[PDB]
């Protein structure tokens, strides 16, 4: 087995993804060698997912015989399930990504938001506070806890965050679709 | 005449101009944009407002800027914001207040009677006219001539000179008014092209628009700019009229009309124009450069269905009760995306520093608020370095003003990191904040 | 080169100028 296979692997397993823009090696390594992850990663039941547009090599749930093995049943997965305010913030984030998407050209940029922004449309469904603190501190909490699952990152000096590129994945339209049913479904009795 | 009324009613609603003039804070925006174009606009903001509370400061800067934007009057491409029309169009609206440039002069009669006789030669398709025209120029010229060579040449007044510099200094300056919005229409004719072929995804034109090598982008504005430009490319005509420019300079009575900005603007017409000119060509080739490579990428079909579902998603999201915390943590069905490892298998540089060490005796100093001698500061604050730090206090009395006493000696002793001792024998010195609070370093 | 030189010296004159005026200061160390 190459070296080079098996740090990619190793690297892959242990962050959950590689970027050609931080790890060009490890992602031309991985990529060429799609055959041979998925056979060293199939005893796991994992599966590799590469998206070339946009530079991202993700690891997911392989999919087996079974028609519900709920993805999150498997010994390996550490993170907690998601609720529905995680998932409209993520939902708003994913509409934020398309809008940076639509206008953008070639040239290395990033998706990056004030919180203030995003604060009146939570606001919107969610409701509104007494004081801005309250609402602040649960903005905070919340970007926390999809920072804990790896969608954004910490904030900086000028109050603003980053959505990273591996929303485009948790927000498939099929991962959508399969959710707006679901919550169809929940509202409607 | 009721039309003029809804009509103005709309631009004072829309137009971000008027807006920006009926913003409570116009003059310190006005001044700070002005003063920028000639991130950090955030912070140069940020300062200029500071010192005028009078009538957050960060926040509201950033408030103030993302609304303009919002609005429209400047824009941001990749890190940087850039001017359109308006902001120009309302700075010179501004300026002009103070003093304008006449225009009803006689001067300006004589220039439209020469332009409006030689626009009703050209229009002429007759070839007869043309000729008879031609001969009477030529008679003129001639009888012109031997009045000159009678001995008649006329030099004109005073004033008449400075209003014709005036006048042209006037004509030959509004070359620049036109630039930005021919940017601004390339840009609205992108984002209308983007539209377009988002909402429509079909392939076949994405394709044939790939194949097709002809210029995109085409509005009257950029035909007028490159016809502008190719006659602006003959330098034959630029010499002459440089050469020309820089003799009359050369007269009495030009300090009597013009101020030295004016003058200098006026020195340098010709290379500044032709860079001006030059400096479109690159905007125009990244433009189409970017819509090509965003025309390659064959995305838009995806982001027209994604964007249909999350419409659908948020038009469910009304038809739930956020004031419930047991239905905002009921848990959704999404798969984990980006799966990573469960954390653990559960198994002589740098030198001396001057600002630190002024920044941490400051503080030391205003927080005691009594003099203090040099015993008592190196108690409190151990050095690193024994020397480079009594040199640089005594350097600070002396600059100071504040006395130092030779007469009398003061023992500290130190120890350094391998243990021993050293003892320094130095004089007396009193240090207090208030003396020395009002000198930089 | 002041570390250098706290190897192989035992005194020092520091010299500081204000204004058109200047002044002179002695040290020592053991």
Redesign the interface.
């Given at each position: 087995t190459p070296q080079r296979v098996r740090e990619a692997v190793q690297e892959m397993?242990?962050?959950?993804?590689l970027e050609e823009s931080h790890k060009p090696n490890l992602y031309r390594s991985a990529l060429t060698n799609i055959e041979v992850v998925d056979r060293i990663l199939e005893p796991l039941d994992l599966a590799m997912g590469v998206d070339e547009?946009r530079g991202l090599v993700?690891?997911?749930?392989r999919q087996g015989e079974v028609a519900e093995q709920d993805?999150?049943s498997h010994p390996?997965?550490?993170?907690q399930?998601?609720?529905?305010?995680q998932?409209?913030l993520i939902?708003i984030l994913?509409?934020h990504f398309?809008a940076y998407?639509?206008?953008?050209?070639?040239?290395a940029?990033q998706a990056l938001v004030?919180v203030?922004?995003l604060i009146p449309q939570l606001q919107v469904?969610?409701?509104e506070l007494g004081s801005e603190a309250k609402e602040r501190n649960r903005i905070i909490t919340l970007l926390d806890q999809l920072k804990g699952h790896?969608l954004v990152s910490a904030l900086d000096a000028?109050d603003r965050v980053i959505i990273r590129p591996?929303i485009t994945?948790?927000?498939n339209?099929e991962?959508?679709?399969?959710?707006?049913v679901?919550?169809?479904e929940?509202?409607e009795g | 005449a009721q039309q003029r009324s809804e009509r103005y009613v709309s631009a004072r609603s829309q137009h971000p101009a008027w807006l920006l003039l009926a913003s409570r804070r116009a003059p310190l925006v006005l001044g700070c944009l002005r003063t920028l174009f000639e991130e950090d606009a955030l912070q140069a903001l940020s300062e200029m407002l500071a010192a005028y509370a009078s009538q957050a400061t960060h926040?509201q800067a950033?408030?103030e800027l993302?609304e303009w934007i919002k609005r429209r009057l400047v824009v941001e491409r990749?890190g940087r914001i850039y001017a359109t029309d308006a902001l120009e169009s309302a700075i010179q609206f501004v300026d002009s207040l103070d003093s304008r440039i006449m225009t009803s002069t006689a001067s300006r009669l004589s220039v439209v009677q020469r332009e409006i006789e030689n626009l009703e030669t050209g229009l002429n398709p007759s070839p007869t006219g043309r000729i008879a025209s031609l001969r009477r120029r030529i008679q003129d010229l001639e009888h012109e001539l031997a009045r000159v060579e009678a001995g008649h040449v006329d030099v004109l007044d005073e004033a008449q000179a400075i209003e014709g510099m005036r006048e042209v200094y006037n004509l030959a300056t509004s070359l620049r008014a036109d630039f930005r919005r021919v940017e601004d229409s390339w840009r609205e004719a992108d984002?209308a092209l983007?539209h377009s072929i988002?909402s429509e995804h079909r392939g076949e034109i994405v394709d044939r628009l790939l194949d097709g090598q002809d210029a995109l982008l085409n509005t009257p504005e950029g035909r007028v700019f490159e016809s502008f430009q190719q006659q602006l490319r003959q330098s034959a005509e630029l010499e002459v009229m440089r050469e020309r420019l820089r003799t009359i300079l050369r007269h009495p009575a030009v300090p009597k009309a013009l101020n030295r900005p004016q003058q200098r603007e006026l020195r340098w017409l010709a290379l500044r124009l032709v860079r001006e000119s030059q400096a479109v060509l690159q905007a125009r080739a990244r433009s189409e450069?970017?819509?090509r490579?965003?025309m390659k990428?064959g995305?838009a079909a995806?982001?027209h269905?994604?964007?249909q579902?999350?419409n659908?998603?948020?038009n469910?999201?009304l038809?739930?009760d956020?004031?419930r915390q047991s239905?905002?943590?009921?848990?959704?069905?999404?798969?984990?995306?980006?799966?990573?490892?469960?954390?653990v298998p559960a198994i002589?540089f740098d030198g001396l520093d001057r600002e630190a060490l002024i920044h941490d005796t400051l503080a030391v100093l205003v927080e005691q608020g009594r003099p203090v001698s040099l015993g008592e500061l190196a108690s409190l604050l151990p050095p690193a370095?024994?020397?480079?730090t009594?040199?640089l206090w005594?350097?600070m009395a002396?600059?100071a003003?504040i006395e130092?006493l030779?007469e009398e000696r003061q023992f500290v002793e130190l120890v350094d990191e391998d243990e021993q001792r050293?003892?320094?024998?130095?004089?007396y010195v009193g240090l207090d904040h208030e003396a020395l609070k009002d000198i930089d370093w | 080169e002041?570390?250098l030189?706290?190897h192989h010296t035992r005194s020092?004159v520091?010299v500081?100028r204000?204004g058109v005026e200047s002044?002179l200061?002695?040290?020592?160390?053991?």
């Open positions: 397993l242990k962050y959950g993804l547009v993700f690891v997911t749930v993805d999150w390996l997965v550490r993170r399930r998601l609720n529905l305010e998932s409209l939902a994913r509409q398309i998407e639509q206008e953008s050209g070639t040239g940029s004030a203030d922004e469904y969610l409701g790896g000028h591996i994945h948790l927000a339209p991962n959508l679709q399969a959710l707006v679901w919550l169809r929940q509202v | 926040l950033g408030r993302r990749e984002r983007r988002i450069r970017d819509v490579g965003f990428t995305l995806e982001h269905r994604v964007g579902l999350l659908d998603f948020f469910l999201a038809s739930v956020w004031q239905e905002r943590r009921k848990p959704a069905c999404l798969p984990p995306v980006g799966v990573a490892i469960t954390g002589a370095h024994d020397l480079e009594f040199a005594l350097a002396r600059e003003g130092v030779t050293w003892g320094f024998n130095l004089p | 002041m570390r030189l706290r020092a520091v500081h204000r002044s200061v002695s040290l020592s160390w053991e």
